[PDB]
Chains A and B, each alone.
Chain A
């Protein structure tokens, strides 16, 4: 016997699930594979950085954008596509000149702020980052060899006593050690990296931004505030001082755990054992979940503070950079946030040992004892938010459709206004006690209106429901009342049969699949809020309390330039935006059939098609189907493929709209 066509999907669904590998027999192999994969991924990141730097160096106009950044537009890379018109000139080129694309990433402001002035510096930087990619791959090879050499040194290893087998658990102490990793991460990788970047700023960035000054004196460490007037960005001296302070704090903190000597520092196990934790820190899924849950606030605050307090030169002067960066980082942090819950569920399925029935000692145990209370209250708050946001929006829509704008229910956002007032009083007290006052903070505090209150309630509803689905999946991954053996099965499995009431979407993976739709919807709400407030603050402040305003004055109204991109009147430089808009609509709708239509129909359809192929004159004498038997996609594969189509469509439909509306 052999396999069917579903082998490809089955293999690719766990192609990186190194725990599911067949040759892997021990944590040594798993940890070494993960470490080597980390090295390869770092190489990929470095090559990507070098790629962007090269294309800015070669197929771009950094040397000219740096001179007049406010009205100029950067170039991403050239367009070489043989499908364009070999005659005339495309709307993306100045007549006979080559074809170009406008960069919406923001690397131009990054390099300008960091101190780049010439193309030659960018070329040297590209070369150095390619060198670093080589170094990373060679480090991967080095560590593979060192661990294989330890394994070979077990050919000259014996304790002369039966305790020699204890060495089995310490072979991967290089990777699995936690105290040393925490100490050196928090100290070196955070604090000293910040201190080195402060040195970079003081040596290059501040010297290459103003007239020549003293030999990088300590007057380069200022405490001004935000939004230097000329470049509309944070003071580079303030940034250097901030990185210096963070570096000092994290360097001091990095001396906490017992890393290299047994006589200094406290152990993480003893820290947890005397607190409300003591979790299984040897689980890789648990660590991954709680660090993905750490990159999530970091990325969300990155999205918030790149816009609110623009740190790069002339970044606020670009109407497309500011929206694209915020939306990108919001989507990245939403993905990481749902990742944290997905891997928490995988941790509970795979890497969690629980007491017999009643020992309420582990934190997961105490959570599982009253998990029903958690889920019931999360459902209650989700229901309240949904009911009272949709109902008030419906009131506003109905009363404004009935020619009565004054009959709306507009709750003044008093709590957010109080927080803003307190923060503004603090900031104004800071500013008034300065001999160099009249500072600006850009959008750190923004006008808050009833529309803001309603949108914040909608966002809270989305977050609550996403957390509800993910938390329910995590807590009932090991067993629910409907299926009280769920931890005997895989993390993702089809169903439990039509009996016992019917059990579609019962696995924890199915809970993740359901929660990804709500993650996408909440992110869409957040991005729509930001983009609408960005396009017209006045119209958002007044007419955003009724959903018809969102439907008309934002979606229908702002989609005018994009659809007009390519038509029977000529093309604009938004032609790619409109074409990708339609393509992403097609991708989004194509995944509906993988979600709505389920397997058996298609399996019968595939049986009919296979009947045809085994009935066609020439095919039957070459291919009997016994080798790679065509079969319909399995249930979990179908749900995942539909989810991928839906996610791709929903995500990639937005950047064309952003570019058409802002540019």
Chain B
């Protein structure tokens, strides 16, 4: 008969539109209370820290987060910058290149990514 496929429907439709959705919702609310929940979008999860440290352990990605990464010979760059600043230093100015860069790198933003203290 044209029916006889409803034997499959009477099991599949209740299953996949009631049992599977209910199990999925229960599993989702259970997953919501894991410490790993939404670790890719929610800040301050343990797995995020472990993944970042794992990336940092790779020899290629050691100095990857540094915005100044790339200077093949930073000593040459610093020496050239110091020489160029010496010829342009205003009168009896007492600022050197080294401490100027050191104090231009050190800013005061305590409340930046402070969420790296729980997980």
Q: Which residues of A contact B (CB under 8 A)?
A: 1, 3, 7-8, 10-11, 14-15, 20-26, 58-59, 78, 80-81, 97-98, 151, 154, 162-163, 165, 167-168, 171, 627-628
B23 in the interface (beta carbon within 8 A)? no
What is the bound-complex CA distance between A3 and B39, given in angstroms?
13
**Contact between chains at A25 and B38 (CB < 8 Å):** no
Partner of B41, one of A20, A58, A59: A20
CB closest chain-B residue, reference A20: B41
**Contact between chains at B41 and A154 (CB < 8 Å):** no
CB closest chain-A residue, reference B48: A22
Interface residue SS majority, chain A: loop
What is the bound-complex CA distance between A11 and B38, given in angstroms?
7
Cβ contacts under 8 Å, B42 to chain A:
3, 7, 11, 22
Cβ contacts under 8 Å, B33 to chain A:
627
Interface code B6-34, partner A: CB below 8 Å = 1, 0 otherwise? 10011001000000000000000000110
**Known contacts A97-B2, A162-B72; A21/B32 CB under 8 A:** no
**Known contacts A22-B48, A154-B60, A167-B60; A78/B6 CB under 8 A:** yes
**Contact between chains at B6 and A7 (CB < 8 Å):** no
**Contact between chains at A23 and B58 (CB < 8 Å):** no
B55 in the interface (beta carbon within 8 A)? yes
**Contact between chains at A25 and B39 (CB < 8 Å):** no
**Contact between chains at A154 and B58 (CB < 8 Å):** yes
> Closest Cβ of chain B: how far from A164's Cβ, in Å?
8
**Contact between chains at A168 and B3 (CB < 8 Å):** no
What is the bound-complex CA distance between A81 and B10, given in angstroms?
9
**Contact between chains at B52 and A58 (CB < 8 Å):** no
**Known contacts A78-B5, A80-B13, A97-B2; A25/B40 CB under 8 A:** no
CB closest chain-B residue, reference A17: B41
Partner of A154, one of B6, B10, B59, B72: B59
CB closest chain-A residue, reference B73: A162
Partner of A80, one of B9, B32, B40, B41: B9
**Known contacts A3-B42, A7-B38, A154-B59; A25/B9 CB under 8 A:** no
24 CB-based A-B contacts, threshold 8 Å: A11-B41, A14-B41, A21-B41, A22-B45, A23-B51, A25-B64, A26-B61, A59-B5, A78-B9, A80-B6, A80-B9, A80-B10, A97-B2, A98-B2, A98-B3, A154-B58, A154-B59, A154-B60, A165-B60, A165-B63, A168-B60, A168-B61, A168-B64, A627-B33
CB closest chain-B residue, reference A18: B40
CB closest chain-B residue, reference A15: B41
What is the bound-complex CA distance between A1 and B44, given in angstroms?
11
B99-119: which residues lie under 8 A (CB-CB) from chain A? 118
Q: Which residues of B contact A (CB under 8 A)?
A: 2-3, 5-6, 9-10, 13, 32-33, 38-43, 45, 47-48, 51-52, 55, 58-61, 63-65, 72, 118
Cβ contacts under 8 Å, B48 to chain A:
22-23
What is the bound-complex CA distance between A21 and B48, given in angstroms?
9
What is the bound-complex CA distance between A23 and B72, given in angstroms?
28
What is the bound-complex CA distance between A242 and B85, given in angstroms?
69
What is the bound-complex CA distance between A628 and B29, given in angstroms?
11
> Closest Cβ of chain B: how far from A12's Cβ, in Å?
9
Best-surrounded residue of A1, A14, A24, A80 (most CB of chain B within 10 A):
A80
**Known contacts A11-B41, A25-B65, A98-B2; A151/B58 CB under 8 A:** yes
Cβ contacts under 8 Å, A171 to chain B:
60
**Contact between chains at B13 and A23 (CB < 8 Å):** no
Cβ contacts under 8 Å, A628 to chain B:
32
Best-surrounded residue of A1, A151, A168 (most CB of chain B within 10 A):
A168
**Contact between chains at B61 and A22 (CB < 8 Å):** no
**Known contacts A22-B45, A162-B72, A167-B60; A58/B5 CB under 8 A:** yes
> Closest Cβ of chain A: how far from B56's Cβ, in Å?
8
**Contact between chains at B41 and A10 (CB < 8 Å):** yes
**Contact between chains at B41 and A25 (CB < 8 Å):** no
What is the bound-complex CA distance between A97 and B55, given in angstroms?
62
> Closest Cβ of chain B: how far from A24's Cβ, in Å?
8
CB closest chain-B residue, reference A162: B72
Cβ contacts under 8 Å, A627 to chain B:
33
Cβ contacts under 8 Å, B39 to chain A:
22-23
**Contact between chains at A25 and B52 (CB < 8 Å):** yes
> Closest Cβ of chain B: how far from A10's Cβ, in Å?
7
Cβ contacts under 8 Å, A15 to chain B:
41
What is the bound-complex CA distance between A423 and B43, given in angstroms?
61
Cβ contacts under 8 Å, A168 to chain B:
60-61, 64
Partner of B64, one of A8, A26, A78, A81: A26
**Contact between chains at B41 and A23 (CB < 8 Å):** no
**Contact between chains at B3 and A97 (CB < 8 Å):** yes
CB closest chain-B residue, reference A165: B60
Cβ contacts under 8 Å, B10 to chain A:
80
What is the bound-complex CA distance between A163 and B60, given in angstroms?
11
CB closest chain-B residue, reference A33: B40
CB closest chain-A residue, reference B10: A80
Best-surrounded residue of A25, A97, A151 (most CB of chain B within 10 A):
A25
What is the bound-complex CA distance between A662 and B9, given in angstroms?
31
> Closest Cβ of chain B: how far from A634's Cβ, in Å?
14
> Closest Cβ of chain A: how far from B79's Cβ, in Å?
18
CB closest chain-B residue, reference A79: B9
Cβ contacts under 8 Å, B32 to chain A:
8, 628
Cβ contacts under 8 Å, A58 to chain B:
5
Cβ contacts under 8 Å, B65 to chain A:
25
Cβ contacts under 8 Å, B38 to chain A:
7, 11
Best-surrounded residue of B32, B40, B45, B64 (most CB of chain A within 10 A):
B40
Best-surrounded residue of B3, B38, B47, B118 (most CB of chain A within 10 A):
B38
Cβ contacts under 8 Å, A163 to chain B:
72
**Contact between chains at B64 and A22 (CB < 8 Å):** no
> Closest Cβ of chain B: how far from A59's Cβ, in Å?
6
Cβ contacts under 8 Å, B55 to chain A:
23, 25-26
